[PDB]
Design a protein around this ligand. Structure first.
Ligand SMILES: [Ca+2]
Length: 124
């Protein structure tokens, strides 16, 4: 893994975005930026050449699964690995996200330890 990979953290709750950014900081990943919704995340990915996306699944403008579908339907962005954040990994939710093309999921509240594990898993 490259500690300098460019990561976009997406969620409507500023406090949560900050917590994720800080946990990533603990793991040595400091090249992190933020978006408050799928609608503001897309243009950042479209013009920013990111390497990884950590998105919450529940957002009011454009939902997490739709951000994922938009990423996968765009020739320029479909390569992007995506980690979804969920309040509970219900089988139905995980199966749908998997069919939509998600790389992995993490259940909140989560720790830096678990985040590290999920990243390794995804980055392969
Ligand atoms: Ca949310």
């Amino acid at each position: 893994l490259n500690k300098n990979m460019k990561i976009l953290i997406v969620d409507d709750f500023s406090t949560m975005r900050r917590i994720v950014k800080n946990l990533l900081r603990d793991l040595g990943f400091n090249n992190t930026q933020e978006a408050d919704d799928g609608l503001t995340a897309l243009p950042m990915l479209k013009k920013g050449d990111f390497d990884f996306v950590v998105t919450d699944w529940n957002m009011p403008g454009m939902q997490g699964i739709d951000l994922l579908k938009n990423i996968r339907a765009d020739e320029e962005l479909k390569h992007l690995p995506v980690l979804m954040i969920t309040a509970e990994a219900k089988r139905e939710q995980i199966i749908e996200a998997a069919q939509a093309g998600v790389n992995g999921y993490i259940v909140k509240p989560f720790t830096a330890a678990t985040l590290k594990e999920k990243l390794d898993k995804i980055f392969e």
